[PDB]
Design a protein around this nucleic acid. Structure first.
Lengths: 405, 49
DNA sequence: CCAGGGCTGATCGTGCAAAAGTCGTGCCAGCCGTCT
């Protein structure tokens, strides 16, 4: 259990990308071989920056106004808002001469460009600009203008009763005028490209042929390190014996590394069989039907230790037709059930999800009610466990989730 | 195809070397009218976010 | 010349106890609907 074993152990504890990193990185030190034109098509997408630049050209400004504008549009973000500030642009242009209204003048015309309200100044001038745009024949333009001007702080509380006595408005009529503001649909910069590229973590594969799915690793992902037969034979006929020692050392380390790697692969596959042997239930039925598993149970299965499996299963991924999942995800705690049995936490989690999703949306169910329901089904859990499982699933509120009945 | 009454004569040069003159009765009777079918597919494209 | 003993390079075993994270669940404080 010296150095060689030591390094072989850190070999399986890490993800496959850092594994290939170290493998390839250490494949340059010792001779151990691993083993319709240029542009695919090429297309230059436009985007809400180039589209704002297009308009600048067409429009008539002077040589000085043109620069200001270039600078302004640089500050525009994906959301649609001038990023910095008004005076900031004046201070960044380095010329003390140019007035602060100079930029305003330009900036007062750039924000009626394509999406109007682009390059707004702090998520409010948008409405002002957007409203001034359409005609004055709209029913409650006065009222809405007055609201937006100085009375947004009050609107923030989603309150309407206070707005009557503050700004001298009518009885609920403003409310219909407040709906006009709701239809404004701010942030016209976010008309951006929804070109979010696709992501993946493929590692081991599970496929369901003739019942009893068989687990087998990826054909391409897994790295195969072989030895050179060419440099092997070259050690016996070496001259200075320095050469020979060099080649012997390279050779022995290579064999070592090879075996280590293989050992990793074999261990991964073995741990990829046990789970499938234990958890056929999950791949067939779902999260609702998972059985609990511990490291100690997997080590006891096939001549294994806890410590060893603990490292294999860290940052490892499995693709099944159910989905893509980490191996660490399968292992979870258990609770005492009816008839001496043990129920997995994932089953209770899916049950809580499906129970909250199918509850009456008019009046929400309290955690105590859910605890009582679960006890009636034969699960026998506390209110704290239910609270934790509910909070864990990006649901802080239980009773605050109340919509219009 | 369909059986249509044909003739072999010039008519103000609307029947050049490889052109064919068609009457209006052909359009009214919906003759040679075809139907094309296309498909549009969309995926959810699950991502990290 | 052959078998017995010492020298030495070649070859390997993926376990084991100690320090830290986790949940089952009780204890306790803050908040709101209702009747007094």
């Amino acid at each position: 259990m010296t150095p060689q074993l030591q390094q072989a152990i850190r070999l399986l504890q890490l993800s496959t990308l850092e594994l290939q990193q170290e493998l390839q990185q250490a494949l340059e030190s010792n001779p151990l071989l691993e083993e319709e034109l240029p542009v695919y098509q090429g297309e230059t997408t436009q985007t809400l920056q180039d589209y704002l630049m297009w308009q600048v050209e067409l429009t008539p400004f002077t040589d000085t106004d043109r620069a200001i504008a270039t600078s302004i549009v640089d500050a525009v973000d994906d959301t649609g808002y001038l990023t910095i500030q008004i005076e900031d642009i004046v201070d960044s242009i380095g010329d003390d001469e140019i007035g602060l209204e100079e930029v305003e003048a330009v900036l007062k015309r750039i924000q009626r460009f394509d999406p109007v309200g682009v390059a707004a100044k702090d998520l409010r001038d948008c409405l002002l600009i957007q409203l001034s745009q359409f005609a004055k024949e709209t029913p409650w333009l006065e009222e809405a203008r007055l609201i937006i001007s100085d009375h947004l702080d009050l609107l923030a509380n989603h309150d309407f009763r206070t707005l009557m006595r503050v700004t001298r408005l009518k009885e609920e009529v403003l409310k219909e005028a407040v709906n006009l503001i709701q239809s404004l649909d701010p942030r016209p910069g976010q008309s951006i490209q929804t070109s979010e590229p696709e992501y993946v973590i493929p590692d081991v594969l599970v496929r369901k042929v003739s019942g009893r799915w068989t687990v087998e690793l990826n054909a391409d992902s897994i790295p195969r390190l072989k030895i050179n037969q060419q440099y092997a034979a070259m050690g016996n006929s070496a001259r200075n014996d320095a050469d020979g020692q060099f080649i012997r050392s390279n050779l022995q380390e290579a064999r070592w590394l090879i075996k280590s790697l293989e050992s990793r692969n074999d261990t991964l596959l073995r741990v990829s069989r046990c789970i499938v042997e234990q958890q056929q239930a999950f791949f067939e039925q779902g999260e609702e039907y998972m059985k609990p598993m511990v490291l100690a149970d997997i080590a006891q299965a096939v001549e294994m230790h806890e410590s060893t499996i603990s490292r294999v299963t860290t940052q490892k991924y499995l693709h099944s037709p159910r989905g893509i999942f980490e191996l660490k995800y399968f292992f979870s705690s258990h609770v005492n059930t009816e008839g001496g049995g043990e129920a997995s936490s994932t089953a209770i989690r899916a049950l809580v999800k499906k129970l909250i999703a199918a509850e009456n949306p008019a009046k929400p169910l309290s955690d105590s009610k859910l605890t009582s329901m679960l006890s009636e089904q034969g699960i026998m859990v506390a209110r704290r466990t239910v609270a934790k499982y509910r909070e864990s699933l990006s649901i802080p509120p239980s009773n605050q989730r109340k919509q219009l009945v | 195809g369909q059986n249509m009454r044909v003739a072999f004569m010039p008519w103000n040069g609307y029947n050049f070397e490889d052109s064919i003159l068609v009457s209006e009765r052909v359009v009214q009777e919906d003759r040679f009218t075809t139907i094309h079918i296309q498909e549009l597919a969309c995926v959810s494209r699950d991502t990290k976010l």
